Design a protein around this ligand. Structure first.
Ligand SMILES: O=C(/C=C/c1ccc(O)c(O)c1)O[C@@H]1C[C@](O)(C(=O)O)C[C@H](O)[C@@H]1O
Ligand SMILES: *Cc1c(COP(=O)(O)O)cnc(C)c1O
Length: 809
């Protein structure tokens, strides 16, 4: 029906129909009379997968024959979402599959909704890994994503009586048609044991063995016939494990628990043994695979054929594991092995919050990984000898830079290990990378300035425009053609349409159509009744104090109080939508969800407010829900305290999809404003330097309460039970934190936020000028393609040239 979805040729549709029927009969063992909607989805998925396999086999052969440098992207999280539609998009099959399914009496969009998200990540870090795989394949790089096949991904969120409840995400229950088990590449991973020194060096002995079984998933590039691999490891017990008899067999579960569940902690490090086991498991299995593939081409060439990218410190044990293999097993001298290791590894940092840094207790590493601890101590001693020679007498610098932190419990600082053992260290937006050089890693920058880089984050325009917003993709394609989908800078050409009355109308119509469709989805799945003429004000992301959902809540209560004070005054109607998951042990984040729902309970049932203000908590925010809500948004809330959000990527998704942004000068917001023009962004609040100045004097929240009567009224409403009438003190923890212990200075940005929100409302009353500003944002969003990001990694870190040429079909 629309050009960006491809051709529906006669031969193609006919063939798709016959293969669909073949899978329904032979694969699923059903006839049309007893087939359930789930059967139809599986028949379709198997049909589409059949089109990947020839290209997958041919791509992997091509890499064997050409022998390029291989890129290994190591991550504990891959937040992939659904695969069916993405696969159709990248193989240009969407219109054909639509027509084929239509002709069988089926609605393809309905079948798409049956697929489970692959929710193998928490938020931004996991999704960046998924966007990166898509871009690496689209740029023709010989790239592999390596992680863990968690049996249970991020929990499904239910809201009961306004409180978050967690339930298990049993995403594999019905099977996964995209993965291929590769039991023949099963490898042993070792734990515990002890170290014996011999004439022939050290030996790690008396270990427990767990098997790592790989499952491969295809990663198709955009219309270029490249299909790369994501390899995920699953834990299996050996067959003699513990071998009364019954209990020995049941105890196999202890080994297999390694790959059972994703830790749901976004930004709060816990030193749990099971998590450490996951980290080593993924590293040890992956490195054996890497070395195997390298041997089937002398270790001096290893960094010419291999790059390893560490997605945060979670796979940081790759550094001492590579040293262990090179020294203990291959018998390279230390200095040679270290040179190879450093030249092979690179590290990406994703946060500056100190509570998110991995600092493992020494006693844990000593029991679990005794040889690795010895290697780490040796790395540290040699590293500090270099620091001492560069900065003689600077004894305090030696303690600050050490990998080993002294204290009540000794710990290993994993970030310090990653810097020491990597040839490149990068942050994820310009301001963040600057902050790394000036503050937390200043000592390391002074020692080795050349290591430190920036690579500003991006998002894939396949998932985040073509897939989720085909209406927008099409009206763009009508004027500038299709090339922009793999070269997003071509969106700049849209600036010449900013005064085009037809283009203005089309852009605004697409937003309206997306809003209507989203409003309908709300009514159907969640019984909720919104006004699609209102401004859609959305904040979706994980719930954390630094992201300041609480600041949004204060604004919502302010509008409510203004309405109550002057009920017969006109106000621009809003639907305020907030969604996101809280980590199960994070009490304050759970209290914030309850506050949002309790505000909703008052505001949504006040007859004086009417349809002028609605507050909705979007349950179970995940990749598939992001694809629905983001195209429907008018206003994107990106309101973290300056200095706390390393980059953000939700921000970029909203910009691409025709929302305007209200935000602080934080993370990538800075670069987004710079690209669009500050006049086309709603910027407010303290800059990083203002936060610094306040810290030096001391933040006193009382001063703001004392000086702003509107803020004082809200705090008194919260305290006295206005929003919790049956439990008057329900929110006293929230009040106490804001008044006495707020690390993120919510009150300090309140006045400027409210004023800036009044300017947003003023512009929304003038649809033509609203839409013109939107066009200026979409037109300048090209920098934020993950294709640009990956090209920079490839050239500046990995030493490989991207390619846009097709492989033969
Ligand atoms: O998602 C994470 C961290 C996850 C994490 C930390 C510690 C753990 O122990 C853990 O299990 C997870 O950071 C993201 C990264 C980001 O989306 C990006 O570059 O992609 C940029 C954002 O600003 C955001 O802060
Ligand atoms: C993009 C995305 C995120 C990251 O959003 P931020 O606003 O950058 O934290 C988190 N969760 C999901 C499901 C996403 O798609």
């Amino acid at each position: 029906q629309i050009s960006v979805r491809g051709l529906a040729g006669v031969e193609n549709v006919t063939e798709l129909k016959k293969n669909f029927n073949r899978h329904l009969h032979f694969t699923l063992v059903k006839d049309r009379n007893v087939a359930t909607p789930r059967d139809y989805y599986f028949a379709l998925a198997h049909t589409v997968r059949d089109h990947l396999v020839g290209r997958w086999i041919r791509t992997q052969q091509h890499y064997y024959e050409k022998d390029p440098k291989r890129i290994y992207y190591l991550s504990l999280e891959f937040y992939m979402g659904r695969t069916l539609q993405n696969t159709m998009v990248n193989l240009a099959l969407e219109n054909a599959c639509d027509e084929a399914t239509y002709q069988l009496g089926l609605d393809m969009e309905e079948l798409e909704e049956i697929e489970e998200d692959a929710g193998l990540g928490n938020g931004g870090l996991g999704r960046l890994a998924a966007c990166f795989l898509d871009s690496m394949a689209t740029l023709g790089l010989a790239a592999y994503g390596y992680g863990i096949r968690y049996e249970f991904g991020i929990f499904n969120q239910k809201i009961c009586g306004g409180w978050q409840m967690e339930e298990a995400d049993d995403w594999l229950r019905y099977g996964n048609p995209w993965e291929k088990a590769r039991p023949e590449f099963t490898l042993p991973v070792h734990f515990y044991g002890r170290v014996e020194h011999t004439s022939q060096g050290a030996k790690w002995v008396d270990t427990q063995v767990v098997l790592a079984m790989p499952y491969d998933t295809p990663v198709p590039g955009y219309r270029n016939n490249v299909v790369n691999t994501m390899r995920l490891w699953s834990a299996k017990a050996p067959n003699d494990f513990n071998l009364g008899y019954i209990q020995a067999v049941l105890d196999r579960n202890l080994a297999e628990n390694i790959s059972r569940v994703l830790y749901p902690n976004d930004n709060f490090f816990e030193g749990k043994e099971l998590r450490l086991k996951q980290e080593y498991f993924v590293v040890a299995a992956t490195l054996q695979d890497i070395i195997r593939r390298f041997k089937s081409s002398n270790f001096d060439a290893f960094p010419d054929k291999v790059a390893i990218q560490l997605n945060d410190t979670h796979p940081s044990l790759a550094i001492p594991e590579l040293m262990r293999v090179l020294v203990d097993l291959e018998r390279l001298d230390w200095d040679k092995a270290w040179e190879v290791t450093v030249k092979t590894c690179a590290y990406t940092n994703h946060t500056v919050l100190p509570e998110a840094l991995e600092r493992w207790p020494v006693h844990l590493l000593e029991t679990l990984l005794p040889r690795h601890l010895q290697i780490i101590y040796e790395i540290n001693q040699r590293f500090l000898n270099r620091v001492a020679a560069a900065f003689p007498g600077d004894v305090d610098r030696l303690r600050r830079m050490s990998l080993v932190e002294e204290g009540a419990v000794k710990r290993i600082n994993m970030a310090h290990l990653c810097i020491a053992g990597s040839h490149a260290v990068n942050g994820v937006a310009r301001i963040h990378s600057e902050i790394l050089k000036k503050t937390i890693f200043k000592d390391f920058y002074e020692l080795e300035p050349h290591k430190f880089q920036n690579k500003t984050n991006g998002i894939t325009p396949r998932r985040w425009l073509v897939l989720c917003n085909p209406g927008l993709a099409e009206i763009i394609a009508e004027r500038i053609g299709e090339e922009y989908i793999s070269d997003l800078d071509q969106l700049r050409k849209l600036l010449s349409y900013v005064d085009d009355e037809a283009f203005i109308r089309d852009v605004a119509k697409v937003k309206q159509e997306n809003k209507l469709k989203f409003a309908a989805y709300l009514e159907r799945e969640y019984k909720v009744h919104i006004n699609p003429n209102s401004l859609f004000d959305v904040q979706v992301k994980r719930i954390h104090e630094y992201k300041r959902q609480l600041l949004n809540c204060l604004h919502v209560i302010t509008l409510y109080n203004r309405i109550k004070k002057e009920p017969n005054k006109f106000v621009v109607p809003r639907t305020v939508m907030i969604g996101g998951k809280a980590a199960p042990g994070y009490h304050m984040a759970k209290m914030i969800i309850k506050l949002i729902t309790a505000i909703g309970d008052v505001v949504n049932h006040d007859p004086v407010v009417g349809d002028r203000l609605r507050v909705i908590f979007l349950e179970n925010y995940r990749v598939s829900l992001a694809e629905k809500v983001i195209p429907a948004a008018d206003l994107s809330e990106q309101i973290s305290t300056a200095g706390t959000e390393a980059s953000g990527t939700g921000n970029m998704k909203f910009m691409l999809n025709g929302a305007l942004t209200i935000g602080t000068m934080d993370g990538a917001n800075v670069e987004m404003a710079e690209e669009a023009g500050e006049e086309n962004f709603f910027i407010f609040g303290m800059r990083v330097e203002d936060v610094d100045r306040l810290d030096q004097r001391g933040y006193n929240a009382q001063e703001y309460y004392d000086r702003i009567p509107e803020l004082r009224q809200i705090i008194e409403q919260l305290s006295s039970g206005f929003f919790s009438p049956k439990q008057p003190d329900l929110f006293k923890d929230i009040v106490n934190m804001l008044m006495h212990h707020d690390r993120f200075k919510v009150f300090a940005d309140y006045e400027e936020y409210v004023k800036c929100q009044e300017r947003v409302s003023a512009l929304y009353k003038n649809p033509r000028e609203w839409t013109r500003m939107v066009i200026r944002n979409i037109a300048t969003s090209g920098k934020f393609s993950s294709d640009r990001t990956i090209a920079q990694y490839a050239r500046e870190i990995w030493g490989v040239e991207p390619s846009r040429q097709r492989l033969p079909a």
